[PDB]
Ligand binder design. Structure first.
Ligand SMILES: *[C@@H]1O[C@H](CO)[C@@H](O[C@@H]2O[C@H](CO)[C@@H](O[C@H]3O[C@H](CO)[C@@H](O)[C@H](O[C@H]4O[C@H](CO)[C@@H](O)[C@H](O)[C@@H]4O[C@H]4O[C@H](CO)[C@@H](O)[C@H](O)[C@@H]4O[C@H]4O[C@H](CO)[C@@H](O)[C@H](O)[C@@H]4O)[C@@H]3O)[C@H](O)[C@H]2NC(C)=O)[C@H](O)[C@H]1NC(C)=O
Ligand SMILES: CC(=O)N[C@@H]1[C@@H](O)[C@H](O[C@@H]2O[C@H](CO)[C@@H](O[C@@H]3O[C@H](CO)[C@@H](O[C@@H]4O[C@H](CO)[C@@H](O[C@@H]5O[C@H](CO)[C@@H](O)[C@H](O)[C@H]5NC(C)=O)[C@H](O)[C@H]4NC(C)=O)[C@H](O)[C@H]3NC(C)=O)[C@H](O)[C@H]2NC(C)=O)[C@@H](CO)O[C@H]1O
Length: 383
């Protein structure tokens, strides 16, 4: 009750080879206080919420099958947006027009109630910095988003619905996008997306979610600790801040002869995993498979500032393991924040067959720290 564990469920994890396949029946409600159903999308024409996958969400009742878990004491919200749906100006057009916001709020309330959702989690990435491009949006996206949140807050309070938002971890995006005091006041929690600080786009090996500054770092703001303290210094309520932990790694293909170190030049994303089928990232269970069966070498930071990374040939993937996930959850408790967020349920070793540290090892670890679930010690991968 004191700490939230916000779990992102992704509907497209259904369209995955049997061993990676994740359905609403795979959710363990004991491991979440709040489930976010990712994603719904904004209709480009009407600027209202709509299903991104009618066949799954509606025809096969995946919306209702997830909101049905509220009988376990879990709150279930619909996530609107995500990275891919945040392309273009549709959300900016929405928040900069008073008539469109008003029609969005009225429709959103009934859309959510029609499927039994307890609320809405805003995942516009990002106000003003459309898909991280801060030159694209107007400076007024900041107030428009703030005003959309205020108007949703007042409309939701009369219905008992929850309102939250997933937000960037980048200092520069925060400055352009977020009225931090207004958002903290009007949102039930703020999910800091404290990951994807580094990836194939840097063209150098880096860690997906550094905890503290590392000496090889070029920028001392690209770490979880800065993001949290920055939101606090910008005026945020500690108890509203929810620290996101990635259940997946950023993978790279390193230029030949550049070594296996941090900051080694890369020419492409890593080879795709069998289940996630996406160059540039691997699920946690795919990383376990590579360490246990394929002999990938785990490299750790003795200073505890970043999680591990794994290597084989010119492949390189940085990720959070059980030890770093425990630390980030312990960091939330030590800092008295709102809780932890998991992206995403399906990228954890939810079956337990890959990592051999029980079912949902990463999520179990977080629940152990924040909610007192007795658990085994962290699993050592190298073993
Ligand atoms: C996450 O991001 C945060 C936000 O930016 C980072 O914030 C920084 O946090 C550090 C905390 O470590 C803070 O540092 C100052 O904290 C207080 C400010 O009021 C000062 O007292 C601190 O001085 C101590 O540390 C200095 C070294 O930096 C040292 O020179 C100074 O003399 C004093 O040393 C004592 O404590 C050391 C640490 O244990 C001992 O090694 C040393 O021997 C001294 O010990 C004696 O005194 C203690 C009481 O003072 C006593 O308890 C002890 O037992 C012994 O008797 C320090 O300057 C920064 O201000 C803060 N930065 C900002 C910008 O806010 C945070 O670091 C980051 N986390 C991580 C993990 O990276
Ligand atoms: C030109 C140039 O070099 N520009 C750089 C710029 O690239 C650097 O900024 C970094 O940009 C990357 C994008 O290029 C940013 O990465 C974003 O990060 C988002 C986090 O805020 C992340 O979205 C959330 O997290 C999930 C995990 O990635 C997302 O899941 C993804 O969902 C998709 C559907 O929408 C799906 O298709 C994907 O498969 C899925 N991926 C996984 C692993 O599951 C999720 O959508 C989203 N969650 C929520 C709740 O909304 C984006 O996914 C990610 N995109 C990409 C393309 O990777 C990164 O944040 C930027 N870094 C920083 C620190 O700001 C910038 C920094 O240097 O430098 C510019 O020069």
């Amino acid at each position: 009750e004191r700490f939230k564990v916000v779990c992102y469920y992704t509907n497209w994890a259904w369209y995955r080879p049997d061993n990676g396949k994740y359905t609403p029946g795979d959710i363990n409600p004991e491991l979440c206080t709040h489930i976010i159903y990712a994603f719904a999308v904004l209709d480009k024409e009407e600027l209202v919420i709509k299903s991104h996958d009618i066949w799954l969400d509606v025809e096969n009742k995946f919306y209702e099958k997830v909101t049905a878990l509220k009988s376990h004491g879990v709150k279930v919200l619909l996530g609107l947006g995500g990275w891919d749906d945040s392309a273009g100006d549709k959300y900016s057009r929405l928040v900069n027009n008073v008539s469109a916001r008003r029609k969005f709020v009225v429709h959103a309330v009934d859309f959510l109630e029609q499927y039994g959702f307890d609320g809405l989690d805003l995942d516009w990435l990002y106000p003003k910095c459309w898909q991280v491009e801060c030159e694209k949006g107007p400076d007024s996206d900041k107030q428009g988003f703030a005003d959309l949140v205020k108007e949703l807050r007042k409309a939701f309070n009369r219905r008992g619905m929850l309102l939250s938002a997933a937000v960037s971890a980048s200092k520069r995006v925060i400055d352009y996008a977020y009225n931090v005091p207004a958002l903290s006041m009007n949102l039930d929690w703020i999910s800091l997306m404290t990951y994807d600080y580094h990836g194939q786009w840097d063209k150098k090996t880096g860690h997906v979610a550094p905890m503290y500054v590392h000496d090889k770092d070029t920028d001392n703001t690209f770490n979880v600790n800065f993001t949290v303290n920055y939101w606090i210094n910008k005026g945020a309520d500690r108890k509203k801040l929810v620290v996101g932990v990635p259940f997946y790694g950023q993978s790279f293909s390193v230029v030949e002869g550049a070594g296996t170190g941090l900051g080694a030049p890369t020419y492409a994303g890593g080879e795709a995993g069998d289940e996630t089928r996406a160059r540039g990232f691997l699920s946690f269970y795919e990383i376990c498979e590579r360490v246990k069966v394929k002999g990938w070498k785990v490299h750790r930071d003795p200073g505890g500032r970043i999680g591990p990374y794994a290597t084989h040939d010119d492949q390189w993937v940085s990720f959070d393991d059980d030890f770093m996930a425990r630390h980030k959850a312990e960091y939330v408790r030590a800092m008295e924040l709102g809780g932890s967020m998991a992206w995403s349920l399906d990228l954890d070793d939810f079956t337990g067959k890959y990592c051999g540290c029980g079912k949902a090892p990463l999520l179990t670890t977080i629940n152990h720290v924040l909610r007192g679930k007795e658990a085994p010690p962290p699993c050592i991968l190298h073993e």
